[PDB]
Ligand binder design. Structure first.
Ligand SMILES: CCN1/C(=C/C/C=C\C=C2/N(CCCCC(=O)NCCCOCCOCCOCCCNC(=O)[C@H](CCC(=O)O)NC(=O)[C@H](CCC(=O)O)NC(=O)[C@H](Cc3cc(-c4ccc(-c5cccc(Cl)c5)cc4)no3)CP(=O)(O)c3ccc(Br)cc3)c3ccc4c(S(=O)(=O)O)cc(S(=O)(=O)O)cc4c3C2(C)C)C(C)(C)c2c1ccc1c(S(=O)(=O)O)cc(S(=O)(=O)O)cc21
Ligand SMILES: [Br-]
Ligand SMILES: [Ca+2]
Ligand SMILES: [Ca+2]
Ligand SMILES: [Ca+2]
Ligand SMILES: [Zn+2]
Ligand SMILES: [Zn+2]
Length: 158
């Protein structure tokens, strides 16, 4: 499967969910990228305006890419694997209620999962792994990437 053929990868937050304050969204996404940068040689750089590899979008229902979202619950988000254009981009279902902690869908955790997909990872069968198909919550201070996630991502980048 595809991998980015560079280690310096940019992202841009196309739009901001009204569920959270902007600073919280920025922080959530930043920390999510940091998860993966902590165990690879990849470096991620935030762009406010202009060209970026990984676009982050909040949208609902059908939103232009042939993979419609399905309203509150069910599918929370999705992301395309490495490549130009839509490649890498990560979309979040706005019909979820995105949150800094629990009491909705935790953005940080979901973003960790999607960025995993953005980087070219598939799913784990290990429920401890962030790349497991279904969402779970833990506090960010308690969160750890599983050995399977680390094995996965290091198999692609190192
Ligand atoms: C039999 C079976 N079935 C059924 C049943 C039913 C039953 C019952 C009912 C009831 N009850 C009784 C009791 C119960 C209790 C409770 O509550 N419980 C619950 C319920 C049960 O159910 C069962 C089921 O199973 C279980 C399991 O589950 C789990 C959960 C899950 N999750 C999920 O899903 C999420 C969502 C959430 C929300 O909501 O929000 N999601 C997710 O996750 C997703 C999924 C996907 C898939 O698919 O896989 N995912 C996603 O999105 C992705 C993204 C992401 C990821 C993430 C993450 C991950 C991970 C993580 C982690 C890891 C590790 C660690 C940590 Cl810390 C973390 C993180 C994160 N993020 O993000 C996506 P992606 O991958 O990117 C993608 C995309 C795209 C593509 Br192409 C690719 C890829 C009862 C009782 C009681 C009651 C009451 S009272 O008052 O009495 O209390 C009341 C009531 S009411 O409502 O009336 O008021 C009620 C009640 C009750 C009841 C009734 C509820 C049913 C459901 C019926 C069914 C069945 C079967 C089948 C079926 C069908 S079919 O077709 O299949 O056949 C269908 C149907 S329908 O309806 O839909 O049509 C149905 C059914
Ligand atoms: Br997709
Ligand atoms: Ca949904
Ligand atoms: Ca892209
Ligand atoms: Ca929302
Ligand atoms: Zn989409
Ligand atoms: Zn997934």
């Amino acid at each position: 499967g595809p991998v980015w053929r560079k280690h310096y990868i940019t992202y841009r937050i196309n739009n901001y969910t009204p569920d959270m304050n902007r600073e919280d969204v920025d922080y959530a996404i930043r920390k999510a990228f940091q998860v993966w940068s902590n165990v690879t040689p990849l470096k991620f750089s935030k762009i406010n305006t202009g060209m970026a590899d990984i676009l982050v979008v909040f949208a609902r229902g059908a939103h232009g890419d042939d993979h419609a979202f399905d309203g509150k619950g069910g599918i929370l988000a999705h992301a395309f694997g490495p490549g130009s254009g839509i490649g890498g981009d990560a979309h979040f279902d706005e019909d979820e209620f995105w949150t800094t902690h629990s009491g909705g869908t935790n953005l940080f955790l979901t973003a960790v999962h999607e960025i995993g997909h953005s980087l070219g990872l598939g799913h784990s069968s290990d429920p401890k792994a962030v790349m497991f198909p279904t969402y779970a919550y833990v506090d960010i201070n308690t969160f750890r990437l599983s050995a399977d996630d680390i094995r996965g991502i290091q198999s692609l980048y190192g």
